[model samples]
Target: ITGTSTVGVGRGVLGDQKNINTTYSTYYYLQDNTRGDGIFTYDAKYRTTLPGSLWADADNQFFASYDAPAVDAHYYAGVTYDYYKNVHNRLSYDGNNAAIRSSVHYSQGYNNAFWNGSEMVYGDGDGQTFIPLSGGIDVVAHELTHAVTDYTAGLIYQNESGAINEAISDIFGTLVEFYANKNPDWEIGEDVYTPGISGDSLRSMSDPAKYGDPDHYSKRYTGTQDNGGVHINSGIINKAAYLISQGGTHYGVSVVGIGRDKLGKIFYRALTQYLTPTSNFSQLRAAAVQSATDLYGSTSQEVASVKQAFDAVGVK
Candidate 1:
């Protein structure tokens, strides 16, 4: 719907009150025209169908309990967009300022969210498991980062390549969380998962094994589940990324931290410039080394840390 841009106040799943970019036509719509082409949020209405109705409000006030997911989905999509544009100098997920769309409240009792290759989708999880996924900015950025990966690397969604894809999402998702600077941590999905639980997340980049994920290549899962252990094996790469940014000693290997911005620059360059659809772990190491060398020179500590981080994760 076309209308004048406006700001609407609402509370998210975590009961955090915030202002969302909306549009005022005959009714207020969860559409933000401030960034890129636009960011449009929709209401899935507890149905499995995609891109459902465009959310409308009679008074431009999104205060109802059902409006929580839509509120965060719309607002965080804007923040994620701002992160890419301001931090990476990239335009939207496609690098072409494409309109971003998201649908929230996707299936009753559903406990996951995904990029869907076209638009972002969030689930209103079973209350015990999750509240609404959009409330987690890291989760939102992680899903949007998949769109970035799809447009750039096009990494195959299986085996090592798939693991790299998953890791890339986690890496950038954590970066975006830090960029937002709102109760940031090296954890994924902590904000919206297990509302009854405390201080635990779906995944931990700082220590993937904290949740039974492997932090080393030798410990990787090679079985025929999760697309050849895409999610499980990603721990190796996620740990490497965390080490690169934060510095760590693992299995007698030490990495000197080069901080987050450099980690992002190196990895962003690798993902968009070097990685191919089928690149494996070894190939990813080479890409990162080459990317770091390109950005910080072959003799720089950044390059050395890239190598040491990958080596620490046994990605040689």
Candidate 2:
């Protein structure tokens, strides 16, 4: 719907109030045209169908209970667009200013969110497990980062490649959370996961073993489940990423912290330039080392940290 751009105020799933970009046609629609090609959010209305309907509010204000997910979906998409454009000089997920779309409240009591090859889909979780996932900026970024991975590395969604894919999403998602400076940490889906529980997360990059996820390559899952342990084995890469950014020692191995910005630069470069569809863990180590060398020179501490981080995680 073509309309004048406007700003609307609303509260998110967790009762956090924020302003969202909206477009005014017959009704105000949750669409922001100011960034990239555009950012559009829709309502799935607790049904299985995708990209349901363009979200609309009677006026330029959204205060109703049902409007919470839409508010965060719209706002976070804009923030993710800004993260790519401002930090990486990439226009959008495709590096072509592609329009970003999200559908919230996807299915009744659905407990997951994902990028369905084309757009983002969020579920209003079963309340006991998760709230609307869009309520968490990191969750939103994690899903959107899938699109970025698809457009760049095109990592095959199986085995080691798939684990790398998942880790990439977690890595950038945490970086985006830090980039937004909103209660940032190296944890994934903490804010919107298990609302009844405190200090818990879906996964922890800083301490993957806390959730029984492998932080070392030696413990990588080789099971057929979870698309060859894509989600489970990802903890290894996630731990390596955390170690690169924050530095730490594990199993008598030490990594020197190079900070978050450098971690992002190295991995972004690796994802865009070096990683391939079937790249395995060892290949990823090489790619990250090469990427760090390209950006910070072979002798720089950034490159050294990249090497040590992978070594610390037994990626060799």
Candidate 3:
């Protein structure tokens, strides 16, 4: 049964608390049970604070087991929910009545995270080189954004189309991370990795040079693996998007002038409003230029910078 919210809705039974630590125990309350211990507890500290008065009821199923995976999964899902709502003014994942369901610990000791048509599934990492995949909000949002792509562009996950899919995810992933108070360096998956690891992250946005092992679309890089290395080649577009937004030198290259907010809006408009599934690099470049011109003007520097940034990434 759901409890009604009062002025002091959640009360800490032990009232001598230094701070407010109201908890919601989610388990079946037995009649003669003195110990009210339950499986789930709603510690408000880790929960999402929505902008306005939109409340979600907590379920009371977890009794004897602590679903650590579910907790982490809920955190990331909450991040995405709060992000799209507050930032984009969208209600949910689909901007409709769509509810996003996520499954955690999908495969035993699995090493990858993906959206399998219905829900987001993550694997518990082997713990040496990888950890639990649900530890990242950006990665969760990235996978969910793929669902958005499927509904919109339906971009084929191969070749240039695949690059676009990955680029869009990286772009929005960085935006989500940046909006969520991350350092605007544009790297993805750094938070999910251990500090002593050789590679800093899955991909580097500020400087792709640091994580060089070739296949990075750089002079020293060679593209191979993962459906022609869409994920690896994606670094190029990711860096390009980052450089354009930051209005700075990218990949040790010359400066391309464009402010963060402007670049972000331009790309957001183009991706959500323009661009088709079969869009190529040339098409993307043109779309951005046209989008900037339409949004700003034909002579706007935003347009010029968009073109220049695309050129810097060899998307001309």
Candidate 4:
């Protein structure tokens, strides 16, 4: 139960490990739902143990005494594994048939979650403002997707590459949330933050305008705060993909293509399979159009609209 290497157990598919009962510690506060089972066991005691400091990029570096929020972390690893396998035919994060390790409760009051080039790490949160960072699928997926991006494009975490890095996370993070069908409206990080806050979420996908943020690309948007506002500027790409897939007029201009999920895949494939460290918006635009053509055929409207939509988002 407290080790680093997974003994080739085939990633526990559909048993108690996959079921709700074994995944959570116990019910925190419930009338009839005593069996608190799901990805992140919602019990009050175990939930508070979300980690503080995680091991760096190395093998079998188990921080055993760290006291992980075991139930929720286990569930998140399960969901992340299932997502890659079921959706993209990817066997694991590397796609080379390897297991991924997730360590929760990393550092004391860490207040953030990140992927350190290998595994995913979670913070215990600020207690008052946020709960355990492990409480949300999007946040978990966001960190894991960072590993995928590192393994694939190896984008240099700055400027357009940084945007690409954050954008890929947001894309797959949103996909994981949607794939789980956890919420009725598909918003990001709703469960991580306490309901005491004024805003609806840390970010918005359907309408960036709702957050009073720029939905279109701007060269001056980079630099200062939130890793050069990688998470903030990511809204532009997020909105572009959302609007393209949703396909409607933005400020009364026509648009077209597949829905949200399909458009996400096109970008995912382009990022993972085509783009490189030096790829900019134009190169990304070309690769996305090519990827759409490859997946849906050259003459498909999806392909054409991806290019059109790329331009529509000010990517050119």
Tell me the lDDT of model 4 at 112.
Answer: 75
Q: Residue-wise lDDT of candidate 4 within 112-204, one digit each (tens)? A: 777767556666677666666766778888788888887888877776667767777877888877777745244567767654774577777
Greater-TM-score candidate between 1 and 4: 1
- C-alpha root-mean-square deviation, candidate 3: 9.0
The true-versus-predicted C-alpha distance at residue 176 of model 4, in Å, is 1.0
- State TM-scores per candidate: 0.98, 0.98, 0.74, 0.76
User: lDDT of all the models against the reference?
Assistant: 0.93, 0.92, 0.58, 0.62
Q: After superposing candidate 4, which stretches have Cα over 4 Å from the reference? A: 1-69, 184-186
Per candidate, the number of residue pairs that clash is: 0, 0, 1, 11
Model 3: lowest-lDDT 10 consecutive positions: 30-39
TM-score comparison, 3 vs 4, better candidate: 4
| Clashes in predicted model 3 | 1
Give the per-residue lDDT digits (tens) of candidate 3, residues 106-179. 55566667776766666656665456666666777788778777776677787666877888887777777777
Candidate 1 ranges with C-alpha deviation above 4 Å? none
RMSD of each: 0.9, 0.9, 9.0, 8.6
